[PDB]
Curated annotation (Swiss-Prot):
This is Periplasmic oligopeptide-binding protein OppA. Induction: Part of the opp operon, which is constitutively expressed. The keyword Plastid does not apply. The gene is oppA. Keywords: Disulfide bond, Peptide transport, Periplasm, Protein transport, Signal, Transport. It is found in: Periplasm. One of its GO terms (cellular component) is outer membrane-bounded periplasmic space. InterPro entries: Peptide/Ni-bd, SBP_5, SBP_5_CS, SBP_5_dom. PANTHER family: PERIPLASMIC BINDING COMPONENT OF ABC TRANSPORTER (PTHR30290), PERIPLASMIC OLIGOPEPTIDE-BINDING PROTEIN-RELATED (PTHR30290:SF10). GO terms for molecular function: peptide transmembrane transporter activity. Belongs to the bacterial solute-binding protein 5 family.
Amino acid sequence: ADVPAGVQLADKQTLVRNNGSEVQSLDPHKIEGVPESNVSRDLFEGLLISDVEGHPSPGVAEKWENKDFKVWTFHLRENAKWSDGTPVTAHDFVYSWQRLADPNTASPYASYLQYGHIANIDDIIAGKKPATDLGVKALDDHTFEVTLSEPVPYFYKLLVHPSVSPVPKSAVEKFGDKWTQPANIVTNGAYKLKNWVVNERIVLERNPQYWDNAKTVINQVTYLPISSEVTDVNRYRSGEIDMTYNNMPIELFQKLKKEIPNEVRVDPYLCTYYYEINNQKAPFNDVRVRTALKLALDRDIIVNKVKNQGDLPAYSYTPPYTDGAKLVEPEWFKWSQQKRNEEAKKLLAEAGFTADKPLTFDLLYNTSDLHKKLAIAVASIWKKNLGVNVNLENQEWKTFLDTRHQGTFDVARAGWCADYNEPTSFLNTMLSDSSNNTAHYKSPAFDKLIADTLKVADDTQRSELYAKAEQQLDKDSAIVPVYYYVNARLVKPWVGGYTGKDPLDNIYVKNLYIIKH
């Protein structure tokens, strides 16, 4: 943390943050969501980290170079250590990236190594080559060298993500799936795990071995798992919580902007809220059905009337303000809702559905006040505009994500946030073979457009290709885009160091501080 000259620090440097739900895991190779990553950034540090404004910056690597954007060499700082005092080395990175690639680990982010195009990853994921063939090596204890199969000028931007953080081999091998318990875990970020009570709290304490420990100010941070945005706001206003999670309740938000304006933080955020259709399950394998659902949803009602929190109606997967996005707004988005409704009714009528044999399906969402209220609104809208019936189903976060990977669903409430600011952070998740493809969308045309982006050495050709890949996704109605999120949350006046400038919202508690109050 960089405490401004003249700020008076509180005697007690503790923080309580709501984290939206109980985490899937604390193992960097078993996680894929925002709540998981929130805790992961305090505990495990990779090659690079985001600074307080989101810029990729030195993490365990103090400096790095690249040869033709294909061979990347990372110089690890000599004093990077784990919480047990042992050195973090390039061997840790070699083991960890191999463990991420290994199919036996079954990471949801195994494809992150495909997104960076590390040599031999496709064969490794497919079981054709052992994980030890991955294009990574330790040239010495403080030098990690990554070899890619093609030039990737933005490669280093990927490296702030939890999936490419180091994990301690000795703890993993000795304790298996209990390596992350407080008595066994070993961490290399600013914090260490103190307590973990499922569905109650995660408590982290400063890690004195952290190389940058002298600049850490907060001594203890607690992450809560509250999925009700109403309860989060209530426990923030009671004094328990210092920073809510960044999902705001429809019940209270308008009142909050009038009651505590300065605490309501609203900043750009590279995330898209959408309804994820399971493209492999009939009748959702029919484009007419998916297009009808996409067109009949009234984004103006949802975004401006039922939610009204500053979000922008969406017509694509990649947010249009992602660095490198130059998207073509489709003609259907400019039409009137009535015109979209008739086209939708027409397509479902064409698909075989009638008043006596209507389309009925499930709408799965993770337990939440906000998602439940939006799903009820969406159900009413679809009922009124298209005559379809939906059965709402809530599931807790960890179970919800497993369901989407299993494909045991029809339509699911979804949100994707960028992991690095470049359109492929979104687009790569729709590749046929992506470990993140919960839409179960498989388009050889889409795959080809993205493969072609690194075969050119020009930004304009790349942007044009991303635009066409989005048009392909749209023509197939792989998803139902709803809105581009804003990052809205409450933060107490005494929490310093939170700019809201990072569109990825990669917060590190090591950068915050509590002002005397």
